[PDB]
């Protein structure tokens, strides 16, 4: 607006701009979809914008939106750059789940993104959906096997 606009040029001196304007950190208007700081930037991808955003905006907890997926499932929604190493340089707690209860592994395996168990096994069955579906049953439920065979590798 007059600040959530440059979130959509993610630019990171347009964001060092609307500093002198300093709107609230994680946009002051969070968009009603909970497109917050990165929940807007990660839903649109922009790391250069998820580095000056941990720097600005690292705030409290964060949240549900009202999507029910905090931003660490909207980051997979635009596969945010280095958000595997960023949600790790932020304590993103790891659970965290989409609208089922499943953590967004038991979202990205119903994807079968081989990626989105590639950054995923790099995090480290045991995620379950609304009705207790193991990641393992929501990848045998999509036959999504490039994640089921990277859920054998994890047993």
């Amino acid at each position: 607006s007059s600040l959530h606009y440059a979130s959509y040029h993610g630019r990171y001196l347009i964001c060092v701009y609307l500093i002198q304007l300093g709107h609230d950190k994680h946009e002051l208007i969070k968009t009603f979809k909970g497109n917050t700081c990165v929940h807007l930037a990660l839903m649109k991808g922009h790391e250069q914008t998820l580095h000056l955003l941990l720097q600005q905006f690292p705030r409290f907890i964060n949240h549900r939106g009202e999507n029910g997926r905090a931003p660490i499932h909207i980051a997979c929604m635009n596969d945010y750059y280095q958000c595997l190493s960023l949600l790790i340089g932020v304590g993103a707690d790891l659970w965290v789940m989409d609208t089922n209860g499943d953590t967004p592994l038991h979202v990205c395996l119903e994807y079968g993104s081989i990626s989105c168990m590639k950054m995923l096994l790099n995090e480290g069955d045991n995620v379950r959906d609304k009705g207790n579906w193991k990641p393992i049953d929501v990848a045998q439920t999509f036959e999504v096997g490039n994640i089921y065979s990277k859920v054998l590798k994890e047993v």
């Binding site: 007059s2 969070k30 968009t31 009603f32 909970g34 409290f60 907890i61 949240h63 009202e66």
Partner: protein, 279 residues
């Protein structure tokens, strides 16, 4: 600090003994953030946590977190009083009407969401804050503006709606003056303070000065009225009310310093010093 004791008590029942404390620590303790775990280790069910469910529309963006607590509230409160609730009829006027001041305040922090930006918006809000002055002016200004003056910004919004309310505190007992002027002699802005930065408000300074016979200090006052007849009396917007709390302190500061003196010879040069006080 009780938070771990405040739970260490509960357990169903003592969750009603977490009520009057933390429903006031939920907003009470600066941050709304104790409503998180509070609203669901206490009521979703009471009228109290149904009004308090709304505020996370304020503190986010999703209006439904206020919403059916217009209509909840418009019922939670025709209800609570319908039968004998009158204006001078004492058991109105002040709880049922603070529990109605719940209701016609749904539409009101929703205008600092709805209208934007530069508009009558401050002047309307001024207004929402003169028109609040109403139905009269006192006590419990704070279960109310404790949560209401969370209207996008605190004494930096209007220290003159306060510390006139810290003239309500000043004038009330120092649990109502001191704790206030423990974070309202913080201003919220301004070292112990600078003899120029607190040049911010001679009025915070008169919130500090009436306070300095609470703080007993005569000779620092008297130092400060001496700092108000040498260095704002040299300073010949805030510069027009100055003579209205500045000769007013060559009387009511000069007053209970003249206390051993008072007769014939003891106001001699303290004749003015008296001269300006009024003439």
């Amino acid at each position: 600090k009780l938070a771990s004791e405040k739970w260490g008590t509960a357990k169903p029942e003592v969750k009603k003994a977490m009520a009057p404390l933390a429903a006031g620590a939920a907003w009470g303790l600066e941050q709304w953030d104790e409503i998180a775990q509070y609203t669901s280790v206490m009521k979703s069910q009471s009228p109290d946590k149904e009004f308090y469910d709304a505020i996370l529309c304020l503190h986010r963006n999703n209006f439904k977190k206020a919403e059916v607590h217009i209509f909840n509230a418009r019922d939670l409160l025709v209800t609570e009083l319908s039968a004998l609730v009158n204006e001078s009829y004492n058991r109105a006027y002040n709880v049922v009407v603070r529990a109605q001041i719940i209701a016609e305040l749904e539409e009101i922090i929703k205008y600092k969401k709805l209208p934007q930006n530069s508009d009558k918006r401050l002047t309307m809000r001024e207004t929402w804050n003169t028109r609040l002055l109403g139905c009269q002016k006192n006590i419990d200004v704070w279960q109310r503006i404790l949560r209401v003056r969370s209207l996008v910004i605190k004494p930096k919004e209007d220290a003159q709606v306060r510390i006139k309310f810290a003239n309500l505190c000043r004038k009330s007992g120092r649990m109502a003056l001191a704790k206030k002027v423990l974070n309202t002699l913080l201003e919220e802005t301004d070292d112990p303070d600078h003899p120029n930065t607190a040049k911010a408000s001679p009025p915070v300074v008169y919130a500090q000065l009436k306070y300095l016979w609470a703080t007993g200090l005569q000779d620092e006052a008297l130092k400060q009225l001496i700092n108000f007849t040498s260095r704002m009396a040299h300073d010949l917007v805030e510069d027009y009310t100055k003579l209205l709390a500045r000769c007013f302190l060559k009387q009511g500061e000069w007053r209970v310093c003249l206390q051993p003196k008072w007769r014939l010879s003891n106001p001699d040069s303290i004749l003015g010093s008296y001269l300006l006080a009024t003439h």
